[PDB]
Amino acid sequence: SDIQMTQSPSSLSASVGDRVTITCRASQSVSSAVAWYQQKPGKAPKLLIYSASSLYSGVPSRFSGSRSGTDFTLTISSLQPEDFATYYCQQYYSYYYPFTFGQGTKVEIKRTVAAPSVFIFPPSDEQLKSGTASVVCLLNNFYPREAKVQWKVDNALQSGNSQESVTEQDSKDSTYSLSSTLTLSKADYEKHKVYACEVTHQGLSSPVTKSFNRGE
Amino acid sequence: EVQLVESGGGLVQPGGSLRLSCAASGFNFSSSSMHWVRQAPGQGLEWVAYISPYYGSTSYADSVKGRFTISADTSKNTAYLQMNSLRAEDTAVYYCARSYGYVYWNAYSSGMDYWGQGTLVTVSSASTKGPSVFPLAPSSKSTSGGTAALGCLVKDYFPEPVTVSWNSGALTSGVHTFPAVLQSSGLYSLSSVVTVPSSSLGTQTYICNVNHKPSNTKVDKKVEPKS
Amino acid sequence: PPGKPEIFKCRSPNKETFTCWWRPGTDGGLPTNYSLTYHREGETLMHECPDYITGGPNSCHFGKQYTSMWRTYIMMVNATNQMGSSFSDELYVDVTYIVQPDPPLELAVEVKPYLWIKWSPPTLIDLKTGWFTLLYEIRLKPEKAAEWEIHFAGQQTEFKILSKYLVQVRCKPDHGYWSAWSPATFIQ
Ligand SMILES: [Ca+2]
């Protein structure tokens, strides 16, 4: 590369309805050869704006792009649930190194707090047959993203043998979902009675447990 | 209707080779130019190369100069990416895409406006392994209000990706598929869950259709509520 | 009611293909589209844009398959709508006149005392017919200097000066557009 594209902030969150502003500063003049792309996760980016400020066909007109000097700004005029994504700028002015991107900006939707509902799944017979055991704890449709999920086996807090992963923010209702998975060897699993996940989240007025005893 | 259709992704040794492929249609290939862009998992996009198929002219991102070659078969409307001396850092989803115009003549493109869906390239000396599919059985919580949760995960597979659907993709509402997680054993694991009314549990069949192409593994697991 | 459209730019990279773009409109009322029809002076048959897609939104693209027969075009944009519908003024297009290239190539600048500047035609442009003759222009100026010094170099691909510097070339093929400046070469 020879022309750099610095993009800020690298994330933000805003309420349905707020005006929102991403800025991209070119390392040197780039006249108007600037594009903006939206990328909703696990999909390919979608052109939003080309030529610094021209709106791409079929893109909703709450989006718009402008330029002064070497700063460009994508601006969503009144934010929407389905606008959850990562946005990138791109210059195509350079003779040798056209089409290079900024580092992108993650945009999250702020919504009213929502407690998760919490479910627990014991390991399957078939998996045990094979000699390991997985306990799954699922937190469903909550907001905000921050949660603590703790695995407890017979009162021992488990660490470094569970693993979690989180969905992308729903664009119908702006909530998340989280699955944690505790894994032990067939041997260990059978060494203990009570299996519990312990969810703390802003939306629950106190922490929540879901547990079970081996065999029941 | 435009369409760019990627292939040739896969799992390769460090130092190995690979040829990606992008078959295009419904815009004038000769008067366009074709791009590869790539995204290492969980980071941003990186432009890799483009070519003007009529002219045969090309540019390459520095990170890739010397090792990858872009080219096009004008008779078949297909751009290629030949990837040599692959390193681990090369691991990513690889999109192809098009702009109006040519190498050195980008002024009039309306950006890169059409994009493939990407194939995934994994550079690693880990072996292919197919997943096991275990049920996540509903019962009392899985049950909150008169709706319950059920799933399958999808344990211990490599390399990505895995596709999951429910009752051949008939059932889609209230389904959540979680991004896969890389376990300490170097295998992937992932879960997929759907929520449904308690009243539908004695009376409606739930099957998850797990496919893991790189290892030739096709599985349908019928998730029933447990005894 | 629309909406009165206007065809505001046409480029061709090399005379072999060309593209025209237009500005809408006033849709609302309902939505709109947007067709571009054209004809050759003297024929009363009215043809539709053969390639809406490859140009970009609000484009029309003319492939090699048009270029090679028809040299010139009369063109019109029809923003039909609902509680309304409306046309643009007609645009005469001659490909020769809208040709713009790629900047001239590998601009080498030597010291030879006195100053040597050589470059090559742009890629994108045939010169072996060579249905272009091709005028070049140079600029230079000390790194921190206030103004540029210009020289029209007419038509060959080399030049000579008499004076810590910065050098660019560009070219036009009359009767069409100047290329963007070649990326700057530096010289001590
Ligand atoms: Ca051929």
Numbering used by the authors:
A (entry chain L): 1 to 216
B (entry chain H): 4 to 230
C (entry chain C): 3 to 114, 121 to 171, 177 to 201
Which of the paper's sentences describe this entry?
A prominent example of this type of promiscuity is the prolactin receptor (PRL-R), which uses the same set of amino acids on its extracellular domain (ECD) to bind to two different hormones: prolactin (PRL) and growth hormone (GH). Prolactin receptor signaling is primarily triggered by homodimerization, which is induced by GH or PRL binding. Thus, the same binding patch on the PRL-R ECD recognizes two distinct binding interfaces on each of two different hormones, yet each hormone activates a distinct biological outcome. Here, we utilized a phage display library to generate synthetic antibodies (sABs) that preferentially modulate hPRL-R function in a hormone-dependent fashion.
To gain insight into the structural basis of the interactions between the sABs and hPRL-R, we determined the crystal structure of the receptor in complex with sAB A8. In the structure, the sAB binds to the opposite face of the ECD away from the hormone-binding site. Interactions between the two molecules are mediated by side chain residues of the CDR loops of the sAB and the hinge region that connects the two tandem fibronectin (FN) domains of hPRL-R. Interestingly, the receptor in complex with the sAB more closely resembles the hGH-bound form than the PRL-bound form. By aligning the FN1 domains of all three structures, the FN2 of the sAB-bound form and the hGH-bound form align well, while the FN2 of the PRL-bound is offset from the other 2 structures. This observation implies that the sAB would have a greater impact on PRL binding than hGH binding. Although hGH has a higher affinity for the receptor (Kd ~1nM) than PRL (Kd ~6nM), the IC50 values for hGH were ~5 fold higher than those for PRL. This indicates that PRL has a more profound inhibitory effect on sAB-receptor interaction than hGH, an observation that is consistent with structure alignments. The structural information gained from the A8-hPRL-R complex reveals the mechanism by which the sAB functions as an allosteric antagonist of PRL activity. We determined the crystal structure of a sAB-hPRL-R complex, which revealed a novel allosteric mechanism of antagonism, whereby the sAB traps the receptor in a conformation more suitable for hGH binding than hPRL.
